[PDB]
């Protein structure tokens, strides 16, 4: 658990985590490496307050309609879970999701999905911004 103290310049504090809402243009796999290069991870969302926090930030802008997060299809377990291997606790799928395409998760704002989780089939060459997290664990 971080304090506000531990958030590097330009990172937002919430719920004992530091978040970077990065506006670059990367694939999911490129976003994963980018977060690592900042000694961080693509964000993992363990509870509804963290989901509400994220939606608050993403609803503050309209340039972008998806941000990559630290979840994808796991071949070992044949399910969607976090990139650290942790199964989902909080479930954030938007209406009608997932599409079950064995892909990578973002927060999506498109038609009936109103800043909620979606799975995209292309984890390499679909470019977007991302959310990194430092949770000091």
């Amino acid at each position: 658990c971080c304090s506000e103290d531990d958030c590097p310049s330009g990172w937002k504090f919430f719920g004992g985590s530091c978040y970077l809402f990065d506006e670059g243009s990367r694939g999911w796999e490129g976003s994963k490496a980018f977060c690592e290069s900042k000694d961080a991870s693509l964000v993992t969302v363990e509870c509804s307050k963290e989901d509400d926090f994220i939606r608050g930030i993403l609803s503050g802008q309209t340039a972008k309609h998806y941000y990559w997060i630290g979840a994808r299809w796991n071949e070992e377990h044949n399910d969607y879970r976090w990139i650290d291997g942790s199964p989902f606790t909080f479930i954030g799928w938007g209406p009608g999701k997932p599409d079950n395409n064995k892909g990578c998760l973002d927060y999506l704002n498109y038609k009936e999905v109103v800043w909620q989780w979606n799975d995209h089939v292309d984890c390499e060459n679909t470019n977007g911004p991302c959310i990194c997290e430092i949770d000091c664990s």
Partner: protein
């Protein structure tokens, strides 16, 4: 539970806050103590949870058993978690449960290396316990 929402002395794991309380109580009084903490005795739905628990209790050597939130359900004629839910994950030690109308504990003794056992004295056998809240 959010990862940083566990009150003081509690540990977060897989959406739950746990308390490993070492005051020794019989199974019923342990149930009551978890209720007083606005929680319940722990229910173990997965191998992941079981391993988290084993990692904590195999770390200490004072206690050989901890009370958890499983007991005989007459209605159903089987051990159930105290919320009424079915025991899906198989965390029993070799040849357990060996009798009905018991309560469950983690047991470190002979062939049971911190797995589930059934005890048939749910009042007067005192031990530590493990509480769980999902903060709902």
């Amino acid at each position: 539970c959010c990862k940083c929402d566990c009150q003081s002395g509690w540990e977060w794991f897989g959406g739950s806050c746990y308390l490993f309380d070492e005051t020794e109580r019989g199974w019923e009084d342990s149930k009551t103590f978890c209720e007083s903490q606005n929680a319940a005795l722990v229910t173990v739905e997965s191998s992941e949870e079981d391993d988290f628990i084993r990692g904590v209790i195999s770390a200490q050597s004072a206690f050989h058993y901890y009370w958890i939130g499983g007991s005989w359900d007459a209605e159903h004629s089987e051990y159930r978690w105290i919320d009424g839910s079915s025991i899906s994950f198989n965390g029993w030690g070799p040849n357990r449960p060996d009798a009905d109308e018991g309560c469950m504990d983690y047991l470190n003794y002979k062939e049971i290396v911190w797995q589930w056992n059934d005890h048939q004295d749910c009042v007067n056998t005192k031990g530590p316990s493990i509480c769980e809240t999902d903060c709902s």
